[PDB]
Design an enzyme around this catalytic site. Structure first.
Site, PDB file in Angstrom:
ATOM      1  N   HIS A   1      -2.923  -3.668   8.152  1.00  0.00           N
ATOM      2  CA  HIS A   1      -3.975  -3.892   7.121  1.00  0.00           C
ATOM      3  C   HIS A   1      -4.739  -2.651   6.778  1.00  0.00           C
ATOM      4  O   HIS A   1      -4.887  -1.619   7.505  1.00  0.00           O
ATOM      5  CB  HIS A   1      -4.957  -4.873   7.781  1.00  0.00           C
ATOM      6  CG  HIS A   1      -4.458  -6.201   7.785  1.00  0.00           C
ATOM      7  ND1 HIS A   1      -4.482  -6.828   6.692  1.00  0.00           N
ATOM      8  CD2 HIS A   1      -4.427  -7.174   8.844  1.00  0.00           C
ATOM      9  CE1 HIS A   1      -4.024  -8.250   6.970  1.00  0.00           C
ATOM     10  NE2 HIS A   1      -4.022  -8.259   8.433  1.00  0.00           N
TER      11      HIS A   1
ATOM     12  N   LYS B   1      -6.244  -8.729  -8.747  1.00  0.00           N
ATOM     13  CA  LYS B   1      -7.220  -8.639  -8.137  1.00  0.00           C
ATOM     14  C   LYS B   1      -7.992  -7.216  -8.606  1.00  0.00           C
ATOM     15  O   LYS B   1      -7.390  -6.400  -9.237  1.00  0.00           O
ATOM     16  CB  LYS B   1      -6.772  -8.153  -6.612  1.00  0.00           C
ATOM     17  CG  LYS B   1      -6.012  -7.291  -6.324  1.00  0.00           C
ATOM     18  CD  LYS B   1      -5.307  -7.149  -4.913  1.00  0.00           C
ATOM     19  CE  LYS B   1      -6.134  -6.358  -3.949  1.00  0.00           C
ATOM     20  NZ  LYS B   1      -5.059  -6.180  -2.923  1.00  0.00           N
ATOM     21  N   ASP B   2      -9.455  -7.096  -8.212  1.00  0.00           N
ATOM     22  CA  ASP B   2     -10.265  -5.995  -8.862  1.00  0.00           C
ATOM     23  C   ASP B   2      -9.736  -4.718  -8.372  1.00  0.00           C
ATOM     24  O   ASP B   2      -9.819  -3.642  -9.284  1.00  0.00           O
ATOM     25  CB  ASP B   2     -11.652  -6.245  -8.208  1.00  0.00           C
ATOM     26  CG  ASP B   2     -12.070  -7.522  -8.671  1.00  0.00           C
ATOM     27  OD1 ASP B   2     -12.158  -7.888  -9.924  1.00  0.00           O
ATOM     28  OD2 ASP B   2     -13.136  -8.098  -7.858  1.00  0.00           O
ATOM     29  N   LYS B   3      -9.052  -4.358  -7.213  1.00  0.00           N
ATOM     30  CA  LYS B   3      -8.485  -3.182  -6.800  1.00  0.00           C
ATOM     31  C   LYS B   3      -7.501  -3.034  -5.892  1.00  0.00           C
ATOM     32  O   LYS B   3      -7.707  -4.119  -4.990  1.00  0.00           O
ATOM     33  CB  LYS B   3      -9.874  -2.214  -6.618  1.00  0.00           C
ATOM     34  CG  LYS B   3     -10.046  -1.878  -5.260  1.00  0.00           C
ATOM     35  CD  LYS B   3      -9.372  -0.392  -4.798  1.00  0.00           C
ATOM     36  CE  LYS B   3     -10.213   0.232  -3.843  1.00  0.00           C
ATOM     37  NZ  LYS B   3     -11.644   0.725  -4.353  1.00  0.00           N
ATOM     38  N   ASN B   4      -6.921  -2.023  -5.676  1.00  0.00           N
ATOM     39  CA  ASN B   4      -5.921  -1.928  -4.672  1.00  0.00           C
ATOM     40  C   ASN B   4      -5.610  -0.273  -4.592  1.00  0.00           C
ATOM     41  O   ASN B   4      -5.563   0.274  -5.460  1.00  0.00           O
ATOM     42  CB  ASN B   4      -4.634  -2.650  -4.839  1.00  0.00           C
ATOM     43  CG  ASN B   4      -3.656  -2.744  -3.569  1.00  0.00           C
ATOM     44  OD1 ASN B   4      -3.774  -3.244  -2.916  1.00  0.00           O
ATOM     45  ND2 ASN B   4      -2.573  -1.993  -3.873  1.00  0.00           N
ATOM     46  N   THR B   5      -5.512   0.085  -3.160  1.00  0.00           N
ATOM     47  CA  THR B   5      -5.490   1.244  -2.891  1.00  0.00           C
ATOM     48  C   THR B   5      -3.897   1.633  -2.667  1.00  0.00           C
ATOM     49  O   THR B   5      -3.576   0.925  -1.682  1.00  0.00           O
ATOM     50  CB  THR B   5      -6.197   2.037  -1.848  1.00  0.00           C
ATOM     51  OG1 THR B   5      -7.720   1.735  -2.107  1.00  0.00           O
ATOM     52  CG2 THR B   5      -6.184   3.560  -1.601  1.00  0.00           C
TER      53      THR B   5
ATOM     54  N   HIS C   1       0.819  -1.204   0.057  1.00  0.00           N
ATOM     55  CA  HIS C   1       0.169   0.061   0.032  1.00  0.00           C
ATOM     56  C   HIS C   1       0.818   1.481   0.050  1.00  0.00           C
ATOM     57  O   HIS C   1       0.268   2.498   0.122  1.00  0.00           O
ATOM     58  CB  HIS C   1      -0.916   0.056   1.056  1.00  0.00           C
ATOM     59  CG  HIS C   1      -1.899  -1.119   1.175  1.00  0.00           C
ATOM     60  ND1 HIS C   1      -2.951  -1.170   0.168  1.00  0.00           N
ATOM     61  CD2 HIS C   1      -2.293  -2.274   1.955  1.00  0.00           C
ATOM     62  CE1 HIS C   1      -3.942  -2.231   0.411  1.00  0.00           C
ATOM     63  NE2 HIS C   1      -3.228  -3.046   1.306  1.00  0.00           N
TER      64      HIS C   1
END
EC number: 3.1.27.-
Length: 104
Positions: free
Chosen positions: A97, A31-35, A10
């Site tokens: 997390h 994966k669909d998304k990650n910030t 992240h």
């Protein structure tokens, strides 16, 4: 799941994250998304100072966020840049997390 993995998943040193390159690697596995948080590590780790037992915390300050969101084509993304507060899970004085953007 620890400070070291949180940083790899992240934290970015560039606001213009190359989503199609980085998200296709084994760590993210399309994966669909990650910030990603565009900031130095210290300001991010400071969010959790003094917190020992696992606890979700919402940042008091705003950060530069770079989001990789998948398009209609699998593992192909669009980068969305914004500034907002975020929620992280703090454990033994460090973020372990990423919970979400804007609220816990």
């Amino acid at each position: 799941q620890d400070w070291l993995t949180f940083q790899k998943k992240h934290i970015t040193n560039t606001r213009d994250v190359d989503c199609d390159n980085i998200l296709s690697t084994n760590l993210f596995h399309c994966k669909d998304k990650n910030t990603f948080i565009y900031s130095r590590p210290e300001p991010v780790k400071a969010i959790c100072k003094g917190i020992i037992a696992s606890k979700n915390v919402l940042t008091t300050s705003e950060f530069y966020l770079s989001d990789c969101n998948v398009t209609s084509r699998p593992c192909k993304y669009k980068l969305k840049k914004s500034t907002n507060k975020f929620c992280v899970t703090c454990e033994n004085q460090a973020p372990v997390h990423f919970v979400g953007v804007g609220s816990c």
